[model samples]
Each structure stands twice: as C-alpha cells, then as structure tokens.
Target: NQDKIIKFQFGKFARALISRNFDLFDSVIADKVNVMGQFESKNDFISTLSSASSKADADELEYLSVDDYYDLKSLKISKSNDTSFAVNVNAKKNDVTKNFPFWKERQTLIFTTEDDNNWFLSSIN
Candidate 1:
C-alpha cells in the first residue's frame, strides 16, 4: 500500500542524486524542508561525501550563507512493506561556522510513513 509508494519515491530520489537530477529532487521535498532541511543537509552531505579515494572527505565549501535553501540530495530507505519504513539521508553542505573560513555540517533525516499514507520526518539528529 503506502510502502510501495514510499519505496518508489525514495528510490527515485536516490537515483536523482547519483545522476545529479536536481529536478527530481525538487518534487519530493516538503516546502519547510526545502528552506531549512536542504541547507543543513547539504552541509552534512558535503562533509561526509565520499569519492573513490577517500574514506570521507574532510574538505568544505565557502561563502555559503543561505538565507534559504531549496535543494537536497537523495535519501536511503529501509522498509518491510508499504505501511512501515524509515528514510535516512546524508546531506553535504558548505561552512555554516563563522571561523576557519570554511566548515561543514552534518544533518541526518530519519523519516517515517504514517498509517494515513503520508510521510513525515519523524526525527532529525
């Protein structure tokens, strides 16, 4: 039921990132998540982003003060069926700190689908 929808949605979202399809990402993220979650997620994403070479890169971005954020990477979902699931995502972003000229932030999104057939971000830490 709802599990299938979430699986499909989450799968597409992840594919979008590996493919760099920003348009696809635009469709799924909630409006509030767009403004706040995206930026925080991005900072988190960049910090832990991996290459074929690094365990997790330590580099960071600069001049990235987002009065607002409208983008996000894909998510990874774990589900037993349509009615129960958890979505986890790691977002890479630029420095939000005022020191070091640059830094990175890590934000984790843990989402769960409700019985009402809607997906809400259940936790973030």
Candidate 2:
C-alpha cells in the first residue's frame, strides 16, 4: 500500500509538471524542500514552476503534450526508511498519438512522511 501510494503521487506530480498545473503541483510539494541542489521555500518553488510553465507554453518545440509524458511501466521504487522513499521516474515527451520521436529524461522523487503519516514530495532531482 505504501508503494502504491508513492507511485500514484509521483505520477500525479509528473503529470502536473507536463501540464504546467501549479495548483495541482503545489498540493503535493512540501513547505520546505530541496530541488536539484538548492533548498527552496514553497513560495519560491511555485515561482519557479510558474516561470517554467510559461516558458514551456510559449516554446512549442520544448513543450510537447503532457498527456503522454509519464512512463509508469518503467517506474522504479525503493524504500530507505519507515518514513522515507525514493522513486525513479522515467518520463518522455511526445505527441498524443505517440507516433512522433520523443525526448526522455530521468528524475528521482524523494518522499517524506510527516508526523500524521501523510507523504509529501520532499525533493526532485
């Protein structure tokens, strides 16, 4: 059940990234989190997401459909502790038909559970 929860949350995050949905994305992120090599506050991360989404929306080549972005079939997950986990997300960008050549990237999703036992995305790199 824990694994499934992590996978589902990670999938949602990937979809949000592709679709540029900050509201949906914000709901899953932690208040204070590390992104890449930088530690960012929730507000700062939202700003970054906003900027990226705007740029992606304007750049056709860089922004393909987010509909087919997530590759759950190749997802990998591992546990580090009772309250922490890491997920390897393999994502691709392509057309809806998936007939066009796609660009792929790999990212790690680090999740941490709070005292209430609710999981949040603590970092992505």
Candidate 3:
C-alpha cells in the first residue's frame, strides 16, 4: 500500500531524471532540497540540472538493486514521528553494470514529506 506509493513516487523521480524532464521535478521535489550536501531551492536545482548531464546516454537505466530503508513494511517505525521513507538502489546509466553503491547506493536520494501525505524529495546525499 504505502510502500508501493513511496516506491512509485520514487520511480517518477528516477524516470524524470533518466528522461531529462526538468518540468517533472516541480511536482516531485520540495521548494528546497539538499543536493549532495548542498541545500538549493527548486529553481536552483532545475537550473543545475539544465547545466549538468542527468539523463541516460544509451537507454533505460539499469536498476541493479533496491533496498528499502525505514523498513518499507516493518512495524518498528511509527508514522507519527517518522515522516520519511527511503530506498537504496544501485543503478547504472546505460542499463548495465553495477557502478552504483559500489560508489555508494541510494544514499543519494532520501524522500521526505511535509506531513501533507505527499512525499517530496527532501535531499540527495
């Protein structure tokens, strides 16, 4: 249920990135985001994307692995205080190879919510 929602939402982000759809970032990201340790506004993030290479060069990205954090289905966490859901994925840009987490996994994208029932990408680190 909720797990699928988070994963699906996260998928939107991945797809948007791979497709190089800058406009899609608006609906999925918050007004502010911490990109690889640098906090940036939505505009700044989009601007950065415009200047950087974020899409796949060959074809669909290869999702090597996905590990749910905050326990996607674990009962140990309480939704009251936990407004975050995350997953670690090792993916490649060319639909092949395990060049991720080998470098450090989905530690890059952590999704957070404003308690509004919608998850927005909170940070990338």
Best by TM-score: 2
lDDT of 3 by residue, 5-122 (tens): 6677776765665555778888888889877667889888776664543332333443322321222232221223367766565533332212221123334466678775888877
Q: Is candidate 1 or candidate 3 better by lDDT?
A: 3
Best-to-worst TM-score order:
2, 3, 1
Candidate 3's TM-score reads 0.63
Q: The CA-based lDDT of model 3 is what?
A: 0.56
User: What are the lDDT figures for the candidates, one per model?
Assistant: 0.41, 0.69, 0.56
Q: How does each model score on TM-score?
A: 0.37, 0.74, 0.63
Which regions of candidate 1 fall more than 4 Å away from where they truly are? 34-85, 88-108, 111-125
lDDT of 2 by residue, 31-113 (tens): 98787767888778777766645644354555544435656676898998999999886766443213212123686778999
RMSD of each: 11.3, 5.6, 6.2
Winning model by lDDT: 2
Query: What's the distance in Å from true for residue 117, model 1?
Result: 6.4
Which residue pairs in candidate 3 have backbone atoms (N, alpha carbon, C) closer than 3 angstroms, thus clashing? 101-104, 101-105
Candidate 2 stretches with Cα past 4 Å from truth are 58-68, 93-104
RMSD of 2: 5.6
